[PDB]
Ligand binder design. Structure first.
Ligand SMILES: [Mg+2]
Ligand SMILES: [Mg+2]
Lengths: 224, 224
């Protein structure tokens, strides 16, 4: 039981990480000692009143991504929604959904992302997002609803992951407040990256273990 | 666009019918000609505020059944919920779920019923319910969450439907308010059967075009 989905918040250096039917709000300390839990562990249903009576309350959220404002997209299997998470507040709302993935992003009909998605993180370029399923990643425009470029392998636009455990997927990803950094998680390891939008590019590069850099996660991952 | 799901109402001679992502309430009037629509045809999200923000409000309901009181199980693909439908009021609520079928009815795990049920009707015997997927049926007790018998073909438990279009599947069903009777629906054809719990009882044989005998469904099915 590891982090299944994550997305980057609207506060500075704050992120949201979904494990099981649960989540935690994190101050993830990109460049200082003290990374710390602001809220949770808490069930999705109990912290997200607006999701208490949906499939996301019952089971949680298995992929996810920040959009803009205090809005993010959230996924469970075939199913997704757009939400207002209302950080450090209580006024969370469903804006679109719950819809299937094919009806929310029609360009995934016939793809491998149709019936479910592992991980996502928000890009720096315009309205771009990187999505990931099995050995494949996808680049999209959540605003125009458009597949910016063809479905390709992770190793193709993130070649620095070849031979690593991310060569064949990602359990969980989220985007950093540090420009062009993203956190990728799988099993019990985490990864930091500097990616450049629209270029075959590297680093990194220092694949680390999660709790050895993430002490505010001890006791909480694994979740068994 | 025909009938997809029905359950019998607690108000005598009334039934709810789910078509597409829509519903109707109806005095289906078995002892009379004076059939009538009571409510709708409305959207599920609108009629049922409890369901407004759910996969059911988005996509409608594909199978349901009366249990007891003002309560009914409702389904769409692998998910389902118990709700109180609050006859003729605002005050309709989610009791249980939304869960997957395999978490609501564990004994369905590994069977055809796990990814979806076609239709279902309340038995007169105890807390028992009959359910159909494809060309098989189940006999359950929803109160002790168990399968009363092995899943066999409709042909085997219901010998009256042999050589009828109902032999390989039912799209929708509900029990009458009269003893040992249920209605069944596939396309534009329907039938009224007289069922004895735990028997090989043949009859009846009245497979009729639905619009012919349901005056108050002209304009509604086939819902385009
Ligand atoms: Mg995942
Ligand atoms: Mg059906």
């Amino acid at each position: 039981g590891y982090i299944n989905a994550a997305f980057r918040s609207s506060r500075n250096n704050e992120a949201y990480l979904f494990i099981n039917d649960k989540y935690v709000l994190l101050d993830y300390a990109p460049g200082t000692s003290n990374d710390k839990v602001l809220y949770g562990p808490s069930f999705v249903r109990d912290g997200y009143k607006s999701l208490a009576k949906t499939i996301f309350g019952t089971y949680g959220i298995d992929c996810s991504f920040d959009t803009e404002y205090n809005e993010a997209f959230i996924f469970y299997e075939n199913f997704c929604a757009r939400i207002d998470y209302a950080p450090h507040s209580d006024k969370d709302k469903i804006i679109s959904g719950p819809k299937k993935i094919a009806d929310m992003f029609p360009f995934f009909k016939g793809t491998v992302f149709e019936n479910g998605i592992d991980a996502a993180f928000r890009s720096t370029k315009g309205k771009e997002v990187y999505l990931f399923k099995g050995d494949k990643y996808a680049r999209i425009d959540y605003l125009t609803n458009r597949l910016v470029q063809n479905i390709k392998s992770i190793s193709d636009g993130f070649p620095c992951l070849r031979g690593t455990i991310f060569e064949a997927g990602m359990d969980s990803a989220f985007a950093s407040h540090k420009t062009n950094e993203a956190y990728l998680f799988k099993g019990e390891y985490y990864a930091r990256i500097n990616f450049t939008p629209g270029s075959t590019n590297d680093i990194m590069g220092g694949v680390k273990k999660t709790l050895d850099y993430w002490p505010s996660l001890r006791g909480i991952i694994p979740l068994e």
